[PDB]
Structure formats: structure tokens, C-alpha cells
Design a protein around this ligand. Structure first.
Ligand SMILES: Cc1ncc(COP(=O)(O)O)c(C=O)c1O
Ligand SMILES: *Cc1c(COP(=O)(O)O)cnc(C)c1O
Lengths: 399, 399
């Protein structure tokens, strides 16, 4: 008989991860990796947060069983997640209009929403920004959903092309899903202003879109509450929406897969009905979520002492990134750059388009050991005082 | 605009988890839970294994980062998993014919395999035993695969109907997937004999099936090596096969979601080619797997001192279940059951069909607070010397 795997086509190379393999292979000393997708501290390390170590020691001393969690995970983890997203006194919580499922990471939350929508609604189309996180298309496609793109990035002024965004979403029908990055847009770091959020919220209601928010970087732009203003503007006007949030970055719990899918409906009776089908899609996927990572988050957010520690560690991460953004611009200037890189200061989060062509990105990698994604995206959190000067010297040399 | 979630139908109750929710709510003090497949010790607790607590202490004091694992997880975890499945000096291992991905539990391993098959091959049908774990149909249906049933259990004699098995499977065409329980068949507890396994291994290669092994209870029938004989018979004869395994139960790591999906192809080139697509299906699902549980398992299996403790803890779990099976049969006769329950002694694992009708199972729950699955499956590992007498008095009362 002929094998079942005989004529399987090899999968293409992942953009972000395909670079990590080429970097680890590079035997040259001093190589710099700006294609990473995680945070690094002043010494180039991705440490475990102090609040997390404390929480983990408490769990080691007090856990008496590893018995299964419910399909939707730790209840306290859900309550605290909804407070972070909507605010302590949100009407969505008091009206019992939101239900939250603990998921393996923000990716798991997007996949659960995709499976839920594909199997239980007439949704057939998801609209994603161009550019966006490359994995968005894979997740919704995995459920058989068509993914269309809407305009976003003005590569001339390094700003949000709001006029083209509206025009490109003209063909988005009622009942279509429109995906928004809550804050720190990946990869451009360009976020709508509060006024622009409100315009989109109003337009979303008139057009009949189902908004889906991807919230992976709460606390990395301006602050916890500030970074949720855009979502809460939608929450105030919409009867229904979906939020896929992640704690991978703002708790440094990347490999513990800590995320949440939050479902909002018109009333308590409708969200409970819908949520039962979301739990069914989780049951047929991974059954129930991993406990350790979410227990840490729940312990920290429910303990005032630990939460004060965590919030300061998040501030330390946010402030270091802004300093590197400023130091990056000043050092490029110091090293003789004629191109204006001021837009870097105006962008939020770990990522920004350097504006380098693929040809310049290629020269950095093979000629200077500086590794960036082919799109020109660079992780500002991968920059340190020790590597800033070599990095900038390389960039200037290819401009 | 009408809502997208307005016309969603509530999901039905899970045959296993819907029962567990009822048990937690029951206020009667003498209630007994024989439903969910979770181990209980002599005191009715589900403790953390001592080896696990020690491994978790090591991790707490030596982990320096939570950085993402690779899509396929911890390497040593994958290596140790293949040794348990195939043996120390397996030809599959030395020939580099096997690839293993760490997955969120055994369920996650099933969904990953299903997603991988539905999107990269011509597989349309999956053959699952009748009866089987209820979630099997849900996992493969959600990936878009049709599920056909083949005969297995002889309800009159309480044994394996090996004739009806071979007959119903003659309708399975080449390229179809046939799911086998590696050991401790859920829910019957009847496993094929080594002679019957070898008969199925030979019939499989002839008809061109794609074997899929669900291995959730390795070490609970007779032993680690002994429980892999059936699989290792297929492995020494097949060019391709898939093994979804779980560490939820033999490590008591339920809520940390520790499993593996192992892919076997004809040669190292085909397996790496197919595995690249499996890693793609994982990326579009949960991205990468949770570390804590798998790290514990790898720490234990790689340290001879810890492993020695774990192997003894697993032996005690296996033996206690066997003692409860004997005690269960002896006590039923003591309490006046008359019917012969000797077949329970010949069944392996946690689960056994009590032979009770759905109506008797219903009476046990409403009238006596004894909670079993509607199929009559009872968890022997939930029986203790303290709850054996009330449990058996209730069963005799409904006979
Ligand atoms: C036969 C079978 N397959 C798969 C599973 C799922 O195991 P896990 O909890 O690790 O997802 C179980 C759990 O009971 C099982 O009995
Ligand atoms: C990182 C990221 C995710 C996924 O986060 P995980 O918790 O690692 O799964 C989703 N969306 C965006 C925009 C991200 O940057």
C-alpha cells in the first residue's frame, strides 16, 4: 500500500521563528537578534518576574492536588481578567454580560473564538489589518474562515492611514468580524487615538460588525487602564464583542500559556447560551486549560501585596522600552544617520517598522550579524546599552 | 441590527463533566463520586505525587526564564516519551523515524493529530471502538473527520468480542484511521491479549489502515513496559502510525495538561516533512505548549533517583486499584448482590462497566448520592475502604 504521508507538502518557513534558526546557527560573536518577539532586560535576559517567583513558591507550599480545572479554568482568573479589561465598576460585569474562558495563551483564545464562530454563527469573514501579526490569518483560516485585509499603515509618514482604513472597510458586511489590536499594534506600534477609537466604535455599530479585540500588550503603551480605553469605547456602544487577551508578555509567562477569551452578548441569558458552545469547542480541542500559569496570575491579581510588586515590574518593562526607543534615535543620529527616525519615539510597544528594505535587512544579517525580520520589523526591547552602538553603526552602514 | 449570538442554541451536557458539576452541587454528606477518571488514594484524596513535588521544587529554584518553548516543546520530554512508548533501543528511535510534539494533554494530542490529518492528507473517516471515550467523536468531528464505530464489547459475557471486532473493521478502507486504546480500554477495561494485538497488527498492514493509538493509562494495567506491548507490536510492522499519549494520570498531573503526539513515518525524510505540517497545525491552535507540567515529567524521567520514586508511586496506584477491584467484588457478595461480578477482577485500569442500566445509574444518583456515568461506567480508583460499604449497599438496592 501507498503511505498516507507520502505526498504531504512541507510547510513553509515561519517568518519570526525561521529567523531564530538562522541566528542560532550563526557562529559569529557579537551577533544581535532584533527579530525576537519577547522582552529582554538591560542584560539581554528574559527573567522570571519577582512577583511570579513569589506566587510560584506560594503554590508549591499550598497546592494539594492537580485535579482537573473546569473547562473555562480558574474562576478568580476570569473575574480578575474582566476587571482588567472593562474596569472594576463596568456595567458589562454588573449586568453579567461577559463570560471569560481561560485559554492556553492569546493564540489559544483566538483559536477558541474562531472555532466557536465557525461552528455556531453565520460569520464567514474576518477582517484583519494590513500589516498584522502573521499568525492571525493562520488561526482563523484553521477554522475555515476567509480573512480579508484592511488598510492601516501609512508608510510615507509612519502614521495611521485612517482615511484609507475607513474606505477599505467599506465592503465589510454586517455580521463580519473586524479584528482590532487593543494597543501596541503588532508590528507597527501605531495605535488609534481615543478620538479615532470612538469614530471606529460608532462606525462599527452602524455597519453591524462583530468586533474582535486582540489584547496581548495591556500595560506596554501608557498603562493598564489607559491601554484599554479603545476597548471600553467599543464596550460602551456594542451589544456583542469578543476579546482575546494574553498574559504572556505583561507577566513574562510566555511558556506557561496564559490567556483568556472573553465573550460579551446583549444580556446575561444570551452570553450564557453562547458560552456553553464556546466550552464545547474547548472540550473538543484541549479539554481544559493549564493551571500553573493562570494560578500565578490569579494569585498576583488577588493579593494586593503581590500586585503592587507586579505593577512596578510592568512599569520597569514599559519604561525601559521607551528609553531604548529614545536612545535608538539619538544613537542613529550620533552614528551619522541622515534619515529621520523620529517616528520611533511616537510608536508604542516592542515593535516598529525600521523602514529598511528587505535588501537592507539582508545586508545587516549577512554582513553585520544583525538579525531583523524581512519586513523591517525590529524589537526595541532587544536593544541594550551594550549593543546599541554596534547595532546603530550597522544600520547607518546600509542606509 | 440583529445580534450574531442571538440564535445560538445552548450546548448539551457533557456525559462526564455534566455529571461532575451535579456532584459538586449535591449537598448530601455521604455522596460518592465514581464518574470522572481521577485517581483517589486510600483516604479519598487526589494528592500531588511526592516525585512531582520534588521536581517542582527543583524547577522553582533553578528556572531562570519563561521564554517560549519551541512549537514541539521540550526536547528531552520528547526523547523520554519515545523511550516509554517504544523502548530504550527501539529501531524507530535509532532510525529517526519518530517525531514527538509536546501537547496540552492527551486531548490536545488527539486534536493536533486530527487537525494535521484533515488538512494535509486524504483521510476522511476515523474508526473508534464502540463504546469508547465520549470525547473521541467530538475531537475528530470538530476537525472535519467522519467517525465510524466498530464492535468491541460483548455485553453478555463481559469480554472482548474479537470476532465482531475483526468483522466490522473489514468495512474500513485503506487510508482510513483506526483508533486503538493502548491499554486500560475506556470504558470497558478489556484490553486485547498480545496474541490479539499481533493479529490486529497484521490485519492492519494488510488492509492499509492508519493506526492511531490513544495511550492515556500506561502503567495502570500490568506495568510500563508490559502495557506498551500492543503498540510495540504495531511499531515493529507498520510504516506509519500516530500515538497520542497523556501523562495526566500516571503522573497525577491532570490540570497541567501534559501530553504528546508522536508521529511515525517510513523514513526520516517523510516524518520531518509531515511533522513540519503538524507544527503548522499547532502554531494555528495554541502556538506552543505549556512548560510547567512537561518540565516536571522530564525532570523526573531523566533523574534516576526521582524516577525510582515515581515508578514506586505508580506501582502503588496500580496495586491499590487492584485491591479495590477485589474488595468491590467481595463486598457486593457480602451485601447480597447475588449476581456474579467476577468479570470486574479481569478488567484493567480505573474504569469498568457495572452493567447497570441508565435507569439504575439514575436511581443511584437521586436516591443514594452515588454518581456514575449513564453508561454504567464506574471509577474503581474512586473507591476506598471507607466508602465501599455504603457504595455496595446502594448498588444492591437498585439491582
Ligand atoms: C482514553 C482517553 N483518551 C484521552 C484522554 C484525555 O487525557 P487528558 O486529560 O490528558 O487530556 C483520556 C482522559 O480520561 C482518556 O481516558
Ligand atoms: C504575542 C501575540 C499574540 C499571542 O500571544 P500568546 O500568549 O503568546 O499566544 C496574539 N496577538 C498578538 C498581536 C501578539 O503580539
Amino acid at each position: 500500500h501507498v503511505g498516507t504521508f507520502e505526498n504531504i507538502t512541507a510547510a513553509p518557513a515561519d517568518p519570526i521563528l525561521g529567523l531564530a534558526d538562522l541566528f542560532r546557527a550563526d557562529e559569529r560573536p557579537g551577533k544581535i537578534n532584533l527579530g525576537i518577539g519577547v522582552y529582554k532586560d538591560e542584560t539581554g535576559k528574559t527573567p522570571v518576574l519577582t512577583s511570579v517567583k513569589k506566587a510560584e513558591q506560594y503554590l508549591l507550599e499550598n497546592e494539594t492536588t492537580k485535579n482537573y480545572l473546569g473547562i473555562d479554568g480558574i474562576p478568580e482568573f476570569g473575574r480578575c481578567t474582566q476587571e482588567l479589561l472593562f474596569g472594576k465598576g463596568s456595567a458589562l460585569i454588573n449586568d453579567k454580560r461577559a463570560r471569560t474562558a481561560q485559554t492556553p495563551g492569546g493564540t489559544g483564545a483566538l483559536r477558541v473564538a474562531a472555532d466557536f464562530l465557525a461552528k455556531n454563527t453565520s460569520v464567514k469573514r474576518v477582517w484583519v489589518s494590513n500589516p498584522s501579526w502573521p499568525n492571525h490569518k493562520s488561526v482563523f483560516n484553521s477554522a475555515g474562515l476567509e480573512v480579508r485585509e484592511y488598510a492601516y499603515y501609512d508608510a510615507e509618514n509612519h502614521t495611521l492611514d485612517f482615511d484609507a482604513l475607513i474606505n477599505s472597510l467599506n465592503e465589510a458586511q454586517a455580521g463580519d468580524v473586524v479584528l482590532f489590536h487593543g494597543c501596541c499594534h503588532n508590528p507597527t506600534g501605531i495605535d488609534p487615538t481615543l478620538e479615532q477609537w470612538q469614530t471606529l466604535a460608532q462606525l462599527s455599530v452602524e455597519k453591524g460588525w462583530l468586533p474582535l479585540f486582540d489584547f496581548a500588550y495591556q500595560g506596554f503603551a501608557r498603562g493598564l487602564e489607559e491601554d484599554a480605553e479603545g476597548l471600553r469605547a467599543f464596550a460602551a456602544m456594542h451589544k456583542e464583542l469578543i476579546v482575546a487577551s494574553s498574559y504572556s508578555k505583561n507577566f513574562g509567562l510566555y511558556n506557561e500559556r496564559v490567556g483568556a477569551c472573553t465573550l460579551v452578548a446583549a444580556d446575561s441569558e444570551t452570553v450564557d447560551r453562547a458560552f456553553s458552545q464556546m466550552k464545547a469547542a474547548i472540550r473538543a480541542n484541549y479539554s481544559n486549560p493549564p493551571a500553573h500559569g493562570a494560578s500565578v496570575v490569579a494569585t498576583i491579581l488577588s493579593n494586593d501585596a503581590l500586585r503592587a510588586i507586579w505593577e512596578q515590574e510592568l512599569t520597569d518593562m514599559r519604561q525601559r522600552i521607551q528609553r531604548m526607543r529614545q536612545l535608538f534615535v539619538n544613537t542613529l543620529q550620533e552614528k551619522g544617520a541622515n534619515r529621520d527616525f523620529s517616528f520611533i519615539i511616537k510608536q508604542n510597544g516592542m515593535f516598529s517598522f525600521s523602514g529598511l528594505t528587505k535588501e537592507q535587512v539582508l545586508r545587516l544579517r549577512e554582513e553585520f550579524g544583525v538579525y531583523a525580520v524581512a519586513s523591517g520589523r525590529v524589537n526595541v526591547a532587544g536593544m541594550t546599552p551594550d549593543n546599541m552602538a554596534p547595532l546603530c553603526e550597522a544600520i547607518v552602514a546600509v542606509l
